[PDB]
């Protein structure tokens, strides 16, 4: 089970990922680091004007040698160690040895609830748990700078 988790994780690869303003269509951010790798605090700089988008299209392209019955993510957004938000995304079935693109639309809260960049930058950690159904495959973390 920890053995399976490890073969799933050993077989997995976040190839690329984009964040795009869903109104203008422009890409605001893209990385190709396997920000999915556990045991390390990754970092990411995003342009602070991302906070002004009404919605952001996140596009993730991933490979998996192993099949997954129900690939999904749970992402907690921590601010100075305090959980502000909890997001759940489901891809579903993953064919063995595939490469897949997963798109998700993340909609902004009303403006009066958006957090300012100056308060967020450097203080936000996104903690992502990678599951196949109920098997926790890994947990990765990213610290965000809004530059």
């Amino acid at each position: 089970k920890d053995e399976r988790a490890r073969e799933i994780l050993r077989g997995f690869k976040l190839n690329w990922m984009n964040l795009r303003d869903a109104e203008t269509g422009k890409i605001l951010w893209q990385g190709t680091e396997d920000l999915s790798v556990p045991g390390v605090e990754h970092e990411a700089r995003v342009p602070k004007k991302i906070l002004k988008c009404k919605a952001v299209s996140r596009e993730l392209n991933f490979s998996s040698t192993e099949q997954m019955e129900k690939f999904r993510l749970e992402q907690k957004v921590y601010f100075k160690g305090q959980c502000l938000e909890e997001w759940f995304f489901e891809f579903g079935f993953v064919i063995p040895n595939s490469t897949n693109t997963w798109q998700s639309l993340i909609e902004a809260a009303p403006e009066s609830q958006m957090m300012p960049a100056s308060v967020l930058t450097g203080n936000v950690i996104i903690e992502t748990k990678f599951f196949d159904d109920d098997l926790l495959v890994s947990t990765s973390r990213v610290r965000l700078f809004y530059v």
Binding site: L19, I50, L51, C53, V56, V77, F79, L84, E85, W87, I106, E107, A108, A109, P110, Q113, M114, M115, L120, V124, L144
Partner: peptide, 5 residues
């Protein structure tokens, strides 16, 4: 609705 994206 996200407050941080």
């Amino acid at each position: 609705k996200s407050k941080t994206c």
